C-alpha cells in the first residue's frame, strides 16, 4: 500500500466525508467572494472623495465588460459619471465582503460538524432536514436527500432557486426588466426565469424518481467527483468556445468593442523616463532632463486602446482561461477517475459492476480495438495536416525548386462549414485538423488511464501488475519500464496537450497556422495574402510569431520580466524530468559530506544537513508543474501583448 | 567561463573517481558493473543516470 | 546438465531485472514478486 501522507494529498476524498465536502466547498465560495470584492475595489477609476483611482490591472479588465453590461461599471469619459461608478463598486465589494464572511462561517462550522445556531439554540441534522422550513416540506415531502442520486432533485431545486434569485436581483437592484428579445441585457433576466422554471420542474422529477445511472458512483466520493470533473471541464471548454463567438457579436459591441476607444494605464507599462542627473523638487524640476514633459516624473504613460486592440485581447484572456482549465479538468477527471479504477481492480469489485460505463470496456479485446482506433486516427490526421503545413512552408521558401503556387492555398474548409469562419482560408482548414489531431493525440494518454490503470495487454503478457497510481517504473528490466503509471500517463496528456493548447493561442491571436513561416522577408512568405485572396493580414507565421509578438514584450519592463521568469521556470523542469535521479542522489551525498567536512574543519562544533533529493514520481510531478506553468506563464504574454491582426492584406512584393 | 568550467568539471571528476563505486553506493552496498547502464530501477527513490556514460551526457549538457 | 544452481538473495536484490533478461524466453525461470511500492524496494526477482 503506497504512502499517501504527502502534503499535497491532505485534502483527498479518502480523508473527508460528505459533510466535510460541503464545508470545504463553502469555505472557498466565501473566499471567492472576498476575491471578487477585491477585483471590484481595484476597478475604481476615481475615488468617491475625488482622489485619483487605481491604474488598470488585468484582473479587472476581464470583468469590466461584464460590470458595464450590468450597469455597476460605466464607460463614460466624464469624472462626474465616473465618480458614482466608484461608489457602486465599493457597494458590491463591501457586499461581497459581508456575504463571503457568512459563507466562511457557514463553512467553518460545517467542516467541524458543529451545526449549532445561538439564536435558535438547536443543532440541525445533516442526515435529515426540512430544507428552509415549510418550503422544503411542501416540495421534498418533509425529508432530505439520502444519497448522491437522491441529491440530484434537491440539488436541481437549489439551482432553480439561485437562478430565480439572480433574475429578481437584476430586476429590482439592477433595473433590467425581463424583455424577451436577445439583443439586450434585459434578455438575461427573461431567461433567468425560464431557466428557473425548467430546473425546478427538472428538480422535482429527479426527487420523486432518483436516477439509477452509474449506481456504483453513489458508493465512492472520488468516482462521482471525477465524472463531475470530466463533465465540468467539457462545460468550461464550451463556455470558452461560446464567449469567443459572442463577445464580438454586434449585440456585445457596447461592452467589448467599446474598450478600443479608451486609453488604458496598466501597471508595469512604459512610464515617463528621466535623465541620470535628475533632481526633482516639490515646486518644479531643477537641473534635470525628463522625457515627454506632459506628465509627472515616473508616471505610467497612456496607451491607445484601438492600437492595442483591447476588445480582442480581453476576449482572448477570458476565452483561453476557460479552455486552459476546461482541458486541465478533463485530464484530471480521467486521472482521479482512473485513480478510483485502480482501487476497484485491487480490491476486485470491477468484474461485478453491471454499469455499461464499466461493463462496456471489461474485455481487453475491445480495449486494444478502441485504443487502436484512437491511435490509428491520430496517426492518419497528425500526419495529413503536418505534411500540409510542411509542404506550404517548403513551397513559399522556394526550397527544392518549388513556388507558393504549388502550396495548399487552394485547400480550404468546404462550403457546408464556411459559416463557422468569418474569413475562410487554409488557415482554417489546418486549424480544425490540428485540433482534431491535437485531441486524438492527448486522448491516447487518456484512454490508457481508463483502460490500463492496473494491467495492460503487455503487462499481462510480462506477468506484471501496476500496484500503484504513482509508481515511476519497474527498474531497467525488459529494456526499461518508465512512465507506466496513470499519474505519468496524466503527465503525458498534459505535455502532449500543450500543442492543441497552443494551436488555440496562435489561432485566436490572429496568426497563420498553414505555414511555419508567414510574413518573413523571404521568397514567397509575403505572397500569401494575394495568392489566396485573404481579407485579413495575419500577424505572422508559426516561427515568425515569436519575433513579431515579442517586439511589444521587449518594450515593456514587466512583460519582459515574465518572459525571463517564465523561461527560467520551464528549463528547470529538465533537471527533474531527465533520467538523472540516481546522479542527483549521489551528488547530494557528496554535498552533505562536503558541507559536514567544511563545517568540521572551519568550526569546532560539527553541523551536518543531509541534503535531500526528490523521487522520480515526486520529480515527474514537479517536472510537469514546472513545464506546464513555465509554458503558459509565457502564453499569457502572447495574448496580453496586443491583438495585431489587421483587416488589410499585403500585395505581392515582386 | 570559470563557473561554466567548474560546473561541467563536476561531471568529469565523477567519471574519474566513481567509475565502479561511489561513497553512496559503497554505503548502499552496490557495484557499477558497467559504463552504460541506465538505472538500477525505482529502488532507493530511484538511481537513474549513475553510469559514467550518463555522467558524460551531463557534462555535454 | 543441471549440475550447478543459481539463486537470488532476496534481501540483497533491488529488482533491477538485469538477470531476468539473460534468461531464455522459452525458459521463464527468473520472475518478479511484488509486495509494496517500488520506490521502497517493494519488488524482487527469483529463480
Amino acid at each position: 500500500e503506497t504512502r499517501s501522507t504527502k502534503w499535497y494529498q491532505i485534502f483527498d476524498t479518502e480523508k473527508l466525508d460528505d459533510e466535510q465536502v460541503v464545508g470545504g466547498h463553502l469555505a472557498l465560495l466565501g473566499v471567492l467572494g472576498f476575491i471578487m470584492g477585491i477585483y471590484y475595489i481595484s476597478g475604481i477609476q476615481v475615488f468617491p472623495w475625488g482622489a485619483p483611482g487605481f491604474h488598470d490591472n488585468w484582473f479587472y479588465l476581464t470583468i469590466k465588460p461584464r460590470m458595464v453590461s450590468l450597469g455597476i461599471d460605466t464607460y463614460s469619459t466624464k469624472t462626474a459619471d465616473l465618480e458614482a461608478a466608484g461608489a457602486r463598486l465599493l457597494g458590491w465589494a463591501a457586499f461581497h465582503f459581508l456575504v463571503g464572511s457568512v459563507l466562511i462561517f457557514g463553512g467553518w462550522r460545517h467542516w467541524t460538524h458543529n451545526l449549532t445556531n445561538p439564536f435558535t439554540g438547536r443543532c440541525g441534522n445533516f442526515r435529515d432536514f426540512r430544507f428552509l422550513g415549510k418550503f422544503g416540506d411542501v416540495v421534498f415531502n418533509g425529508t432530505s436527500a439520502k444519497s448522491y442520486k437522491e441529491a440530484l432533485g434537491p440539488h436541481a431545486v437549489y439551482m432553480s432557486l439561485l437562478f430565480l434569485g439572480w433574475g429578481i436581483v437584476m430586476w429590482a437592484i439592477l433595473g433590467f426588466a425581463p424583455i424577451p428579445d436577445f439583443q439586450t441585457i434585459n434578455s438575461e433576466t427573461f431567461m433567468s426565469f425560464v431557466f428557473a422554471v425548467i430546473f425546478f420542474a427538472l428538480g422535482i422529477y429527479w426527487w420523486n424518481n432518483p436516477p439509477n445511472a452509474a449506481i456504483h458512483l453513489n458508493d465512492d466520493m472520488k468516482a462521482a467527483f471525477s465524472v463531475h470533473l470530466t463533465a465540468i471541464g467539457y462545460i468550461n471548454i464550451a463556455l470558452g468556445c461560446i464567449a469567443f463567438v459572442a463577445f464580438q457579436q454586434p449585440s456585445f459591441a457596447p461592452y467589448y468593442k467599446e474598450l478600443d476607444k479608451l486609453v488604458f494605464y496598466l501597471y508595469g507599462e512604459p512610464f515617463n523616463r528621466v535623465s541620470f542627473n535628475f533632481v526633482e523638487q516639490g515646486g518644479k524640476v531643477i537641473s534635470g532632463a525628463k522625457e515627454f514633459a506632459d506628465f509627472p516624473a515616473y508616471a505610467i504613460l497612456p496607451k491607445s486602446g484601438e492600437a492595442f486592440g483591447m476588445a480582442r485581447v480581453v476576449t482572448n484572456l477570458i476565452v483561453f482561461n476557460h479552455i486552459i482549465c476546461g482541458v486541465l479538468y478533463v485530464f484530471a477527471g480521467v486521472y482521479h477517475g482512473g485513480q478510483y479504477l485502480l482501487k476497484i481492480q485491487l480490491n476486485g469489485m470491477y468484474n461485478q459492476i453491471k454499469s455499461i460505463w464499466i461493463t462496456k470496456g471489461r474485455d481487453q479485446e475491445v480495449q486494444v480495438k478502441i485504443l487502436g482506433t484512437v491511435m490509428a486516427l491520430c496517426f492518419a490526421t497528425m500526419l495529413s495536416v503536418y505534411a500540409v503545413i510542411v509542404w506550404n512552408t517548403i513551397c513559399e521558401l522556394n526550397i527544392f525548386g518549388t513556388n507558393i503556387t504549388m502550396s495548399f492555398y487552394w485547400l480550404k474548409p468546404l462550403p457546408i462549414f464556411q459559416w463557422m469562419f468569418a474569413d475562410p482560408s487554409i488557415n482554417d482548414w489546418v486549424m480544425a485538423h490540428v485540433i482534431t489531431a491535437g485531441s486524438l493525440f492527448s486522448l491516447i494518454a487518456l484512454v490508457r488511464i481508463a483502460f490500463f490503470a492496473h494491467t495492460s495487454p503487455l503487462w499481462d503478457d510480462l506477468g506484471l501488475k501496476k500496484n500503484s497510481y504513482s509508481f515511476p517504473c519497474l527498474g531497467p528490466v525488459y529494456g526499461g519500464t518508465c512512465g507506466v503509471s496513470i499519474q505519468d500517463q496524466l503527465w503525458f496528456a498534459m505535455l502532449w496537450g500543450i500543442k492543441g493548447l497552443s494551436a488555440v493561442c496562435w489561432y485566436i491571436d490572429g496568426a497563420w497556422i498553414a505555414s511555419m513561416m508567414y510574413g518573413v522577408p523571404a521568397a514567397d512568405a509575403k505572397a500569401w495574402d494575394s495568392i489566396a485572396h485573404l481579407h485579413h493580414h495575419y500577424t505572422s507565421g508559426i516561427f515568425y510569431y515569436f519575433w513579431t509578438e515579442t517586439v511589444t514584450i521587449f518594450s515593456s519592463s514587466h512583460l519582459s520580466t515574465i518572459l525571463m521568469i517564465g523561461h527560467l521556470v520551464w528549463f528547470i523542469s529538465f533537471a527533474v524530468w531527465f533520467e538523472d535521479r540516481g546522479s542527483r542522489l549521489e551528488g547530494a551525498d557528496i554535498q552533505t559530506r562536503t558541507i559536514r567536512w567544511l563545517g568540521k574543519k572551519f568550526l569546532n562544533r560539527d553541523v551536518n544537513f543531509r541534503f535531500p533529493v526528490l523521487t522520480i514520481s515526486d520529480s515527474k510531478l514537479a517536472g510537469t508543474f514546472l513545464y506546464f506553468g513555465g509554458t503558459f506563464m509565457l502564453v499569457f504574454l502572447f495574448l496580453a501583448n496586443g491583438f495585431y491582426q489587421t483587416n488589410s492584406p499585403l500585395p505581392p512584393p515582386v | 567561463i570559470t563557473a561554466g568550467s567548474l560546473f561541467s568539471l563536476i561531471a568529469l571528476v565523477r567519471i574519474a573517481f566513481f567509475a565502479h563505486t561511489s561513497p553512496l553506493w559503497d554505503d548502499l552496498g552496490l557495484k557499477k558493473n558497467s559504463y552504460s547502464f541506465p538505472c538500477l530501477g525505482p529502488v532507493y527513490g530511484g538511481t537513474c543516470g549513475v553510469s559514467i556514460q550518463d555522467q558524460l551526457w551531463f557534462a555535454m549538457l | 546438465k543441471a549440475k550447478k544452481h543459481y539463486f537470488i538473495i532476496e534481501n540483497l536484490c533491488v529488482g533491477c531485472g538485469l538477470c531476468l533478461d539473460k534468461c531464455p524466453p522459452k525458459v521463464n525461470a527468473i520472475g518478479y514478486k511484488f509486495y509494496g511500492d517500488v520506490q521502497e524496494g517493494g519488488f524482487r526477482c527469483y529463480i
Binding site: 503478457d461 510480462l462 | 558497467s34 | 533478461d21 522459452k26
Partner: peptide, 20 residues
Amino acid sequence: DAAKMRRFLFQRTETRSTKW
C-alpha cells in the same frame, strides 16, 4: 505468443551486447 514476443524485447536489452 508470449515467449516469441519476449525473444524480441530480449533482442533489445540493457545488458552487454554488440552495437553498430
